[PDB]
Each structure stands twice: as structure tokens, then as C-alpha cells.
A paper describes a structure:
Anti-chemokine activity has been described in the extracts of tick salivary glands, and we have recently described the cloning and characterization of such chemokine binding proteins from a tick salivary gland cDNA library, which we have named Evasins. [name] is a small 94-amino acid protein which binds [name]/MIP-1α and CCL4/MIP-1β with very high affinity (0.16 and 0.81 nM, respectively), and also displays lower affinity binding (3.2 nM) to a closely related member of the CC chemokine family, CCL18/ PARC. The [name] secondary structure is composed of seven beta strands forming three anti-parallel beta sheets, one short alpha helix, and contains four disulfide bridges.
The structure was solved by molecular replacement using the previously determined structure of the non-glycosylated form of [name]. The unit cell contains 3 molecules per asymmetric unit: monomer A (Asp8-His95), monomer B (Gly11-Trp89) and monomer C (Asp8-Trp89). The corresponding solvent content of 67% and the glycosylation content may explain the 2.70 Å diffraction limit of the crystals. Monomer A had the lowest overall B-factor (53.9A3) compared to the other two monomers, had the largest stretch of visible amino acids (8 to 95), and will thus be used as the reference glycosylated structure in the discussion below. Residue Asn19 was the only one of the three predicted glycosylation sites, which displayed clear electron density for a sugar moiety. Only one saccharide unit, built as an N-acetyl D-glucosamine, could be successfully modelled into all three monomers of Evasin1-glycosylated on residue Asn19. Asn19 is at the C-terminal end of the 1st β-strand (β1) and is well exposed to solvent. There is a clear hydrogen bond interaction between the acetamide group of the glucosamine and the side chain of Thr22.
Author numbering: 8 to 95
The structure:
């Protein structure tokens, strides 16, 4: 019974995933990533609103107590759908 499910990610030009929020809904189950996990602080809708295959500078951060805390560095990043095809 229940629960949990994987976090969404963006990748760099080569496909290395970095998650994009530190919390998730799983239907009504909430997950929180461990304090310290790499993440981009852009959010699930931040991810959805990104044009498939185009590059964004995504602000890097580290997770703490469920929020991606930015670290003022930035890194070049990507939303890739199945078969690279176009968003939404
Ligand atoms: C993305 O990251 C991984 C490890 O952090 C690395 O081996 C790879 O070359 C990276 N891709 C680019 C284009 O920077
Ligand atoms: C993670 O870090 C925060 C604040 O730095 C702390 O208050 C919190 O209890 C920590 N949680 C765990 C399980 O490490």
C-alpha cells in the first residue's frame, strides 16, 4: 500500500539529471528529498513551462528541509521529453 514515486529532473547537454524541486506530490503522498541533494531551483511548473530541448541557465542549489536553496551559481540546462520530441 502507498507510495512515493520519483522526482522530475532537467539534464545538462549530455543527460545528467538533476531534480528540480525538493518536494513532490505522489497523488496525495508528499515526498521530501534528503537535506544536501543537488537540485535546480526551478520547481515542477518551472520545469513544465520550459521549452523542450532548448537551453536555459538553470540556478543551481542544494536541498534543505524541503526547499532548493540556491547557491548563486548557475548551470546550463535542459527539459527533454521521450524521444526528444516537442513539449506538451
Ligand atoms: C554533465 O555532467 C556529468 C557529471 O557531473 C559529466 O560527466 C558531463 O560531461 C556533463 N555534460 C556537459 C555537457 O557539461
Ligand atoms: C535538515 O536541516 C535543517 C536546517 O539546517 C534542520 O533543522 C532539519 O531538522 C534537518 N533535517 C534532517 C532530517 O536532517
Amino acid at each position: 500500500d502507498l507510495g512515493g514515486c520519483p522526482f522530475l529532473v532537467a539534464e545538462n547537454k549530455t543527460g545528467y539529471p538533476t531534480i528540480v524541486a525538493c518536494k513532490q506530490d505522489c497523488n496525495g503522498t508528499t515526498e521530501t528529498a534528503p537535506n544536501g541533494t543537488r537540485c535546480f531551483s526551478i520547481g515542477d511548473e518551472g520545469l513544465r513551462r520550459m521549452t523542450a530541448n532548448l537551453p536555459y541557465d538553470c540556478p543551481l542549489g542544494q536541498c534543505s528541509n524541503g526547499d532548493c536553496i540556491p547557491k548563486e551559481t548557475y548551470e546550463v540546462c535542459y527539459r527533454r521529453n521521450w524521444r526528444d520530441k516537442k513539449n506538451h
